[PDB]
Structures are given as structure tokens and as C-alpha cells.
Design a protein around this nucleic acid. Structure first.
Lengths: 107, 464
DNA sequence: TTTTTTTTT
């Protein structure tokens, strides 16, 4: 699976991407930290929103494997997420080619 | 994990998982039993076959890294049960050093140093190789506590076992190259000064006793010696190099023959950590030109953002010129060219001295360039960065041009003639190989300087 | 307790 294949409502998404940017942390009303990370493939880029502590571990340049991801539209923006029973795992850094475009998370 | 530091984000390390499996195999036979009974059990098990032999050796190895109170016993058992002179262990050490060193737990690092020293004393085959791989993990431009610890730790092994070091010509040259370079970084605290003195004495003794072996380094040895010339021990060494070279060796005529000898690539490479190399090689082979910004930012953030890191920059530059010689296919593609990498690195300099050292490193193979002995790929980045910076950043073109002229009488004044000849040969050969067809439009470009455009239209008549 | 087709205006 590639970034370009991601569609609203799809689940059990398994793919690899490199992170380009980590956004600022916001807090949900029940106390969770959330941050948006821009990640990319050779087929383009998409935002992933990451809750809680793993969100602070992620760094730009990280090559990450997502398992059991799902996708949904938040504020007009197609967004990627870690599902129940899924996880994010860093498997390398820096050495991955990617395209910024298209940005599948643009409203 | 017992070997490596891991966050909850980190994937499980396959190598760590395999070593832990082996340790647990050894442990199943050694726990709850006497030491004689344990050795009988391991002996038996190893005899079953060659994969069992690997399991046991790797197991004992991992116990040495993870159980310091069992380490001496386990090395003894390792030496006893090993059938391949500990070769499988040496490969795994090199693998750990090249791939895992940054994630290696403090205990495991401490233990690995202990193990290598124990390997040297035992006269194990390939130990010198392991020491060189170890030295490569000591990062230039890094005075963090852990890095300094490694510098001193490896130095202590080398000095205590100097007789053994003398058996390895390559290890002599490599140790001298490594420590001559690190000495530049070691000042600012009492701790750093005390380590520098030990590094000075060590390098001096090898240079004087084994000069000829040190010469296999080639001309970059001079660059390193200039950078430490004001240290008293080295001033003495210089007057011997300049005035009576014969004391150093009957086969050493003088500094010129050393300047006319190319630097071997393994020396330029040993001053980049595995991670530095992997990143630069990736940038110069896979990154499309126009797409390099985030890669540069990521590299800069990790390696070039501290004041202490400034010295690392000449190593990167010598590495780009002398080690990275891209195929014809890469050169004819849209891949990030070497000159753009060089241009990027030059802009990260934060002082005039750093800038000057960076420029010298860039032009270093120009100085005594002979077209039949030297590679044109070593001198290509400088001319290409000058050329391609004409329009966009004419500041860079100007200053490098200025340096190219002024380095001729200044680099080493008693050899201005030779240096002049070198720069001329470089320029000529750059035309003959069509790296840059015409040298004239670089010296009259309207976007240049009042004084410089004049200084150019003089220093070489052949380019109007 | 592994959050998770999550996110106050």
C-alpha cells in the first residue's frame, strides 16, 4: 500500500513513510496531546495525527512503518491514523526518496 | 532489550533478537551448574555442528557485553570453545560497531571496549581491523562525554599495547591520522587538555619511530600536521621535517614528496562515522537536485549545529572530493551533484577561520595536482561550485577565486612555484577533460567585484 | 493498561 492509495474509511492500512515535519502539540478536552506529522512516499504526502507519548518520540527524517492504520477526513482534510491493534514503528531514518506532491491532506 | 537502547517507537532490532536468543541457549546450559560442568556442556553442544558453534560463540559474546560480573569467565570459555579463532565474534563486533554503535547501551559499550582490549592481548587475528572500526566511531567535532570517553578508551588500549600496534602498518597510519585530527577538538576543559597531551605524545612517538609507515597516508598528513603545528611537540617535529628530514627516515627526502603523494581514500573515510557516510552517500546518489533541503536540514541539525562541530566540516569536504567519485550515470542524471553539497557546506561556516580551513580542504588536491597521478574528480567540485555560483550566489564564486589566488604564495611559501604549477595544471586539465570548456567567462563576469575582476584578468593571462 | 474509523469555539 502507498500514500496515494489511502481513501476515507479504509482501515487495516499497512505502509511505510518518512516524516517530513512534526507539527505543534494541541490538547484534547480530556487531556490527550495530539500532533500532526506530514509524512511521504514516492507517491506523495499525507498528514498523520498522533496521540500521546509516541507523538513526542517521532522526528523529521524518521522512516516509519504503520500497521492497521485507518483514514478519515478531519476539518476537510484526509488524514491518516493508527488503528486499534495497530502501531507506528521506526525502522530507519533519512535514507528514503519521497515526493511532497500531491498533498493528499489538502482541503 | 539487553544490547540496545530503544524507545517504544523503535522497531525490534533483528541482530539484538538473534544475540539474545544465543545468550539464552548458552544460559540454558550454564545456569545452576558448576563451571567445569558448564564447559563440558558447551563443549558437547558445539560438537553437534557448525550452527551450534555459532550459537555458543555468539552467546558467550553477548554475555560478555551484558554481564560484566560473568565477562572474564565467559571470555575464557569463549577462547576455549571457539574453533575459528573467534572470527565469527570479530565479524559480529564489526557489525555492531558499523550498524548499532549509537544505540549500544552504556554497559555494553564499556564491555565491548574491555573485550577488544582482551582480544588485542590474546593476539587474535583481525584485532587490528576491529581497532580501526572502533576508531571510526569516534566522531570528529564532538566533545560530548560519551564521545570523549571513547577517544580516551581506545587510545589507552593502543598505548598500553603499542608493541602489538607496531605489527600493523595500516593501524599505525590510521591511528596517527585519527588522533592528529581529534587533537584539534580537545581543548576548553582540563579534561580535554589532559586527553590532548596523551594524544600528542602517542602520535609523536609513532611519527618519529615509524615515519615511513605514516607516509602511506599521503598529502592530507600535511594538512593535519599544520593544524597542530603550534603545539610544542609538533613544532619540534616540524623543524625536523623541514630542516633535517633524515632523522625521521633516510627514505624521506622532504615535505615535497609527501605533498606530491595522493591521500588514500580509507584515511579520508575513517573520519566520517558510519551514519555520516550513509547519509552523504545517499544525498549524492539518490537525492534529486532541487529536493535536497530537508536532507540538508536533517544532516545539519545532527552534525553541524554546535560550535564544536565546525572542525567536522573539512572532513566532509575532503570526503566529498576524494571518496565520492560518482559513476557516469549519476553524473548525467538529475541527482544532487557534489558541487551543490560543497556549496551547502561552505555556507554553514560560522567564522572566518572555519571558512579558510574549509576552502583549503576544498582546494587541497589542486595545490600539487599532477594530471597523470591525481584524479580529476578531486579538483572538479571546486571549479564547478565556482562556475555554478556565478549568477545565484556570486559571493561564493568571488571568495573562492580570491582564495585560489592567495593560497599560492601563502599555503607553504618555499614552494609557491610548485603550488602555482599545481593550480595551473588543475585548471588546464579541467579544460582538457571538458569539466568546464571555457575559463574566460568566469573572470570577466559583470556580476563580480571591481577589485577581483581585475585581480582575475591578471593572475592568469591565458583566460581573457 | 495499548489510547485509536479519537480531536470543545
Amino acid at each position: 500500500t502507498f500514500v496515494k492509495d489511502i481513501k476515507p474509511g479504509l482501515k487495516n492500512l499497512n505502509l511505510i513513510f518518512i516524516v517530513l515535519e512534526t507539527g505543534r502539540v494541541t490538547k484534547t478536552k480530556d487531556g490527550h496531546e495530539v500532533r500532526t506529522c506530514k509524512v511521504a512516499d514516492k507517491t506523495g504526502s499525507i498528514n498523520i495525527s498522533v496521540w500521546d507519548d509516541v507523538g513526542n518520540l517521532i522526528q523529521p527524517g524518521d522512516i516509519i512503518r504503520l500497521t492497521k492504520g485507518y483514514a478519515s477526513v478531519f476539518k476537510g482534510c484526509l488524514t491518516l491514523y493508527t488503528g486499534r491493534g495497530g502501531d507506528l514503528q521506526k525502522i530507519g531514518e533519512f535514507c528514503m526518496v519521497y515526493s511532497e506532491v500531491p498533498n493528499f491532506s489538502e482541503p | 532489550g539487553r544490547l540496545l537502547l530503544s524507545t517504544s517507537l523503535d522497531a525490534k532490532d533483528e541482530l539484538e533478537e538473534r544475540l539474545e536468543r544465543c545468550m539464552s541457549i548458552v544460559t540454558s546450559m550454564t545456569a545452576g551448574v558448576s563451571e567445569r560442568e558448564a564447559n563440558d556442556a558447551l563443549n558437547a553442544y558445539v560438537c553437534k555442528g557448525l550452527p551450534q558453534h555459532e550459537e555458543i560463540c555468539l552467546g558467550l559474546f553477548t554475555l560478555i557485553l551484558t554481564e560484566p560480573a560473568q565477562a572474564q569467565k565467559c571470555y575464557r570459555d569463549l577462547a576455549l570453545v571457539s574453533r575459528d579463532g573467534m572470527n565469527i565474534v570479530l565479524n559480529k563486533i564489526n557489525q555492531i560497531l558499523m550498524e548499532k554503535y549509537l544505540k549500544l547501551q552504556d554497559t555494553c559499550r564499556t564491555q565491548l571496549v574491555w573485550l577488544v582490549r582482551e582480544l588485542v592481548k590474546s593476539g587474535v587475528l583481525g584485532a587490528d581491523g576491529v581497532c580501526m572500526t572502533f576508531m571510526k566511531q569516534i566522531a570528529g567535532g564532538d566533545v560530548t562525554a560519551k564521545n570523549i570517553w571513547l577517544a580516551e578508551s581506545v587510545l589507552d588500549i593502543l598505548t598500553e599495547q603499542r608493541e602489538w600496534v607496531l605489527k600493523s602498518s595500516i593501524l599505525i597510519a590510521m591511528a596517527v591520522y585519527t588522533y592528529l585530527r581529534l587533537i584539534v577538538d580537545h581543548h576548553g576543559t582540563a579534561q580535554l587538555q589532559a586527553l590532548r597531551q596523551k594524544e600528542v605524545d602517542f602520535c609523536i612517538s609513532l611519527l618519529r619511530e615509524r615515519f615511513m609507515e605514516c607516509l602511506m597516508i599521503g598529502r592530507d598528513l600535511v594538512r593535519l600536521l599544520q593544524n597542530v603545528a603550534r603545539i610544542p611537540e609538533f613544532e619540534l617535529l616540524w623543524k625536523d621535517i623541514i630542516h633535517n628530514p633524515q632523522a625521521l627516515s633516510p627514505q624521506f627526502t622532504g615535505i615535497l614528496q609527501l605533498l606530491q603523494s595522493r591521500t588514500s581514500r580509507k584515511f579520508l573515510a575513517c573520519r566520517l562515522t558510519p551514519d555520516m557516510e550513509t547519509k552523504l552517500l545517499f544525498m549524492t546518489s539518490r537525492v534529486r537536485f532541487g529536493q535536497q533541503k530537508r536532507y540538508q536540514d536533517w544532516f545539519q541539525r545532527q552534525y553541524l549545529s554546535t560550535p564544536d562541530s565546525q572542525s567536522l566540516r573539512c572532513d566532509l569536504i575532503r570526503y566529498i572530493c576524494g571518496v565520492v567519485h560518482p559513476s557516469n550515470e549519476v553524473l548525467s542524471s538529475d541527482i544532487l551533484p557534489r558541487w551543490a553539497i560543497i556549496g551547502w557546506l561552505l555556507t554553514t561556516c560560522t567564522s572566518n577561520v572555519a571558512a579558510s580551513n574549509a576552502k583549503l580542504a576544498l582546494f587541497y588536491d589542486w595545490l600539487f595536482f599532477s594530471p597523470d597521478k591525481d584524479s580529476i574528480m578531486n579538483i572538479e567540485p571546486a571549479i564547478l561550485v565556482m562556475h555554478h555560483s556565478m549568477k545565484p550566489h556570486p559571493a561564493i564564486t568571488a571568495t573562492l577565486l580570491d582564495f585560489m589566488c592567495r593560497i599560492i604564495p601563502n599555503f607553504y611559501p618555499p614552494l609557491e612555484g610548485h603550488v602555482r604549477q599545481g593550480v595551473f595544471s588543475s585548471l588546464n586539465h579541467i579544460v582538457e577533460k571538458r569539466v568546464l570548456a571555457h575559463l574566460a567567462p568566469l573572470f570577466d563576469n559583470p556580476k563580480l567585484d571591481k577589485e577581483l575582476r581585475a585581480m582575475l584578468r591578471e593572475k592568469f593571462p591565458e583566460f581573457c
